[PDB]
Amino acid sequence: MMIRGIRGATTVERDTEEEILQKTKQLLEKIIEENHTKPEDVVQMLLSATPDLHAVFPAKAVRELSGWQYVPVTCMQEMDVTGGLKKCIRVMMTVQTDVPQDQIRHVYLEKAVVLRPDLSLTKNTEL
Amino acid sequence: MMIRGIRGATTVERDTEEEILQKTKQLLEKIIEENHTKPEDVVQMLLSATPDLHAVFPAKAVRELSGWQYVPVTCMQEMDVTGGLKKCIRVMMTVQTDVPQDQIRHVYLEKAVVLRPDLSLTKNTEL
Amino acid sequence: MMIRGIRGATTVERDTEEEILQKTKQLLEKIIEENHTKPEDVVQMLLSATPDLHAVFPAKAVRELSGWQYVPVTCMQEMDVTGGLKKCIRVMMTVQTDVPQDQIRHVYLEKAVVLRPDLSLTKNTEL
C-alpha cells in the first residue's frame, strides 16, 4: 500500500557514543510510540549527523533495538549550513502506513524543539 | 500503481539564501509541471548540496511551497568529486505513481543540464 | 506490494574511478543476484561514500549497468566516524518485493565484510 516518510530530529550535548546512542534511541522510541510503528512495516531508515559528530554511527542504536535487527538503515552527513543546529541527529524513517500525510507525527526533541513547524517565535517571553 | 523516485538537479551562481531557495523552488515547480505530482502523493524527499553551499537548507523551499507543508523532507551533503559540478543542488523525490519508470521526467536545470544522460528511448525500445 | 530497502557495502584499495566502478558494479551485481532484483521494481537507490573518496560518483556504475539507466539514483557523503571503515561505498536499494524483511539478502563485500551482522562481532572472541 502507501508508504510515508517520518521525520525526527534530536541533539546531544557532546560528541560521545553514550550520548549519540541514548538520544538516537530515545528519538526512535518516541517516533515509534507516536506513530505506532512496527519494525516489519519499516521500508528503510536514514539517519544524518552534523559534521561535528564523530563518535559512532547513530544507526547502531537502531540496530540494537529489540525487534529492529532486520530494519535496513544507513547514515549520512547532514549538509553543513552556516547557522544550522549543531550536534544534531536527524531521521527519515520510511514506513508502510495508511495514515494520511497530514496526520503523520514527526518528532523534534532536545534542542531540536526549535525545528517544530507549528511554532512562531516569541518576541517578548516575559511580559 | 507503484512508488518511484524522481531526480532533479540545479545550480546557483552564488552561495546565498535567495539563490538557493529560488533555484530549489524552480526545480520543484518544474518537476511538478512535468510529472503532475500532488504533494499528498509524495512519500518523502531528500535534497543534497555540494559542500561549497552553506547558506540555507534547500528543504526550506519545499516546506514553504503552498500545499507542500506536510511533505517530509531532509537534506544531506553531496560527495565532493574531483571535477564534480559545483554549487549544485540535487533532489530525490519519492512518489506514488502509475507512470512507468522510463517516463518519469527527471529535471536538470541551470548548469546541471550538463548532467543529463541524453538517453534515447526511441532506440532503446528497438535494439 | 510492500517496498523494502536492501543494504550493501564494499571497499576500494585506491580512490580511483576504475576501482570505485569495479567494486560498486560487483556489489550491485551480487545484490541483484541474491535478491533476484529487476530494475523496473527498483523505486530508487542511494549510494554513500566516505569522505576519502573523490574520484567518481559511485552511482555511475548504476547508470551504466545495462537496463538500469532509468533507475533513479543519487549519492551522499557518509558521516566521518573516528575508526569508521575507510574507502567505503554503501548502498540503500529500495525495491518492490513480497520477500519478508528477515529474508532480504543484504550484501557486504571486500573489507566491508566486517559490517556483516554475523561477522561484525567476531572480533569480540579475540580482543
UniProtKB/Swiss-Prot annotation, chains A, B, C:
Top-level division of the source organism's lineage: Bacteria
GO (cellular component) term, any one: cytoplasm
Catalytic reaction(s) noted: chorismate = prephenate
GO-annotated biological processes: amino acid biosynthetic process; aromatic amino acid family biosynthetic process; chorismate metabolic process
UniProt pathway: Metabolic intermediate biosynthesis; prephenate biosynthesis; prephenate from chorismate: step 1/1
Localization in the cell: Cytoplasm
SUPFAM superfamilies: YjgF-like
Limits of the Chorismate mutase aroH-type domain: 3-121
Keyword Hydrolase belongs to the record: no
Keywords per UniProt: Amino-acid biosynthesis, Aromatic amino acid biosynthesis, Cytoplasm, Isomerase
Residues bound to prephenate: 7, 74-78, 90, 108
Documented effect of changing residue 90 to K: Low decrease in catalytic efficiency and in affinity
EC assignment: 5.4.99.5
Entry annotated with the keyword Zinc: no
Pfam (any one): CM_1
GO MF terms held by the record: chorismate mutase activity
Function of the molecule: Catalyzes the Claisen rearrangement of chorismate to prephenate. Probably involved in the aromatic amino acid biosynthesis.
PANTHER family in the cross-refs: CHORISMATE MUTASE (PTHR21164), CHORISMATE MUTASE AROH (PTHR21164:SF0)
Other observations noted: This enzyme is monofunctional, and its activity is unaffected by the end-product aromatic amino acids.
Record's subunit section: Homotrimer.
Protein name: Chorismate mutase AroH
